[PDB]
Write a structure and sequence with these properties.
Blueprint (H helix, E strand, L loop, with lengths): L6 E4 L7 E8 L8 E7 L8 E8 L3 E8 L2 E2 L3 E3 L10 E7 L3 E6 L2 E7 L9 E6 L1 E8 L5
Antiparallel strand pairs: 1-11, 2-8, 2-12, 3-4, 3-11, 4-5, 5-6, 5-7, 8-9, 9-10
This protein binds N-ethylmaleimide (2 copies).
């Protein structure tokens, strides 16, 4: 809807930062839509990825990093709090030791830092969703 997808926004993250995304799947879970959020080290899409979050709605969630052009060890979770045909609010918080991902207010996934959050310069949100809101909190030093 409101925001274009793929959506790209230059960003800076540090401990205490929060990335909030509000959106909705474009098709029924039965047709398996995806959602992907990538934290890049450069403004270019072929750059390394500090945190890659991919949701196969109704199936699994996969998380990884791409360092020096190579994907590393994948982490998969079968935890699936997303609701079929519903709007969702995804919140990603930067803790000192890891990212904590909340879905509609409930802790659902965590991912220990492999590269310092300070290396992030861009965030891209894409795949089968409409995006109504995207916000990065620049509250802390
Ligand atoms: C929850 C029922 N539903 C779907 O499965 C896709 C759109 C919708 O409203
Ligand atoms: C290499 C494995 N992988 C992909 O191909 C996309 C995300 C991921 O972890």
């Amino acid at each position: 809807s409101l925001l274009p997808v793929p959506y790209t926004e230059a960003a800076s993250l540090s401990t205490g930062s929060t990335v909030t995304i509000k959106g909705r799947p474009l098709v029924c879970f039965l047709n398996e839509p995806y959602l992907q959020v990538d934290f890049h080290t450069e403004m270019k899409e072929e750059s390394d990825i500090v945190f890659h979050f991919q949701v196969c709605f109704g199936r699994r969630v996969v998380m990884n990093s791409r360092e020096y052009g190579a994907w590393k060890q994948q982490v998969e979770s079968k935890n699936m709090p997303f609701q079929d045909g519903q709007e969702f609010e995804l919140s990603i918080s930067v803790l000192p030791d890891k990212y904590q991902v909340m879905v509609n207010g409930q802790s659902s996934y965590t991912f220990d830092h492999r590269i310092k959050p300070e290396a992030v310069k861009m965030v891209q949100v894409w795949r089968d969703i409409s995006l109504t809101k995207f916000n990065v909190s620049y509250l802390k030093r």
